[PDB]
Amino acid sequence: MAGQSDRKAALLDQVARVGKALANGRRLQILDLLAQGERAVEAIATATGMNLTTASANLQALKSGGLVEARREGTRQYYRIAGEDVARLFALVQVVADEHLEHHHHHH
Amino acid sequence: MAGQSDRKAALLDQVARVGKALANGRRLQILDLLAQGERAVEAIATATGMNLTTASANLQALKSGGLVEARREGTRQYYRIAGEDVARLFALVQVVADEHLEHHHHHH
């Protein structure tokens, strides 16, 4: 209670940070693809129709946000969602948006 | 038959939209405040130390993302989290953020 703890602003900073990474749309194609399995940069880029150079750039953007991480198998860099925390969050935002855009008139 | 149709792309646009709303720290504080109950613009503005007109813009942005809804009674415009689903999202990301905000050292 002494004074006030504004450290929560750093918490909001992290929330905004992951938001900035997610807010793009095209980079969500990466998350969606990684949710189907962890993949190498070459695989992710080509599959989504993006250049490897540009992919590495925005993968680092997602990595710094805290969405994805990278593992080195041999000489390939495989990207995977940092943790199920972000994975389930991405699944959540997909579902919550889906059932709102597809607001079905359930009626029998 | 159905060969190829990229419909998921529009779904990602909606996700990017809510991401932009979450990418605003000043407005995230409002979400944490409105998670405590529905309150009129005047109350929200004063509590945060922001102008009513500016707060309205902040609130409108959140509402446009689908974060909060406008529940009007009498002569007051109360803002509240659009749904429990959305509240659980903000709660989730807040927990995820906090979980990464200094994980500390557990040596017991």
- Angle between helices A41-48 and A52-65 in degrees, nearest 10: 110
State residue B36 phi and psi, 5-degree precision.
-100, -10
Q: What's the structural domain count of chain B?
A: 1
DSSP β-bridge partners for residue A92: none
Q: Residue with structure tokens 């500390």?
A: B104
Strands (E), chain B: 39-40, 68-73, 76-81
CB of B8 within 8 Å of any CB in chain A? yes
Helix and strand numbers (H, E) in chain A are 5, 3
A93 CB neighbours in chain B (<8 A) are 15, 18-19, 89
For residue B36, what is the enclosing H or E element?
none
Sheet of A68-73: strands edge to edge?
A39-40, A76-81, A68-73
Q: Please report the sign of the dihedral spanned by the C-alpha atoms of residue A46, residue A49, residue A52, residue A58.
A: negative
Q: Residue with structure tokens 């009626």?
A: A107
> B 12-71 residues with CB below 8 A of A?
12-25, 28-29, 32, 66
Residue B72 sits in a domain whose CATH number is 1.10.10.10
Measured CA to CA, the distance from residue B70 to residue B60 in angstroms comes to 9
Q: In which region does residue B37 sit, left (phi positive, over 0), alpha (psi from -120 to 50) or beta (all else)?
A: left
Measured CA to CA, the distance from residue A7 to residue B84 in angstroms comes to 26
B94 CB neighbours in chain A (<8 A) are 11, 15
Measured CA to CA, the distance from residue B54 to residue B95 in angstroms comes to 28
Q: Which of A83, A18, A70 is nearest to A44 (CA)?
A: A70
For residue B3, what is the enclosing H or E element?
none
- List the structure tokens of A64: 């710094």
Q: Which of A69, A82, A67 is nearest to A20 (CA)?
A: A67
Method of determination used here? NMR
Strands (E), B3-98: 39-40, 68-73, 76-81
Count CA within 13 A, CB hemisphere, residue A61: 17
What is the domain extent for residue A25? 1-108
DSSP β-bridge partners for residue A70: A79
For residue B9, what is the enclosing H or E element?
helix B8-22
Burial of B16 (0-12, 13-18, 19+ CB in 10 A): buried
What does each C-alpha distance from A69 to A25, A66, B91 come to in angstroms? 19, 8, 23
Q: What is the dihedral of CA A87, A93, A98, A99, to 10 degrees?
A: 110
Cβ–Cβ under 8 Å, residues A78 and A70: yes
Measured CA to CA, the distance from residue A52 to residue B87 in angstroms comes to 37
Measured CA to CA, the distance from residue A93 to residue A95 in angstroms comes to 6
DSSP β-bridge partners for residue A80: A69
First to last CA, chain B: 61
Contact B16 A10 (CB under 8 A): no
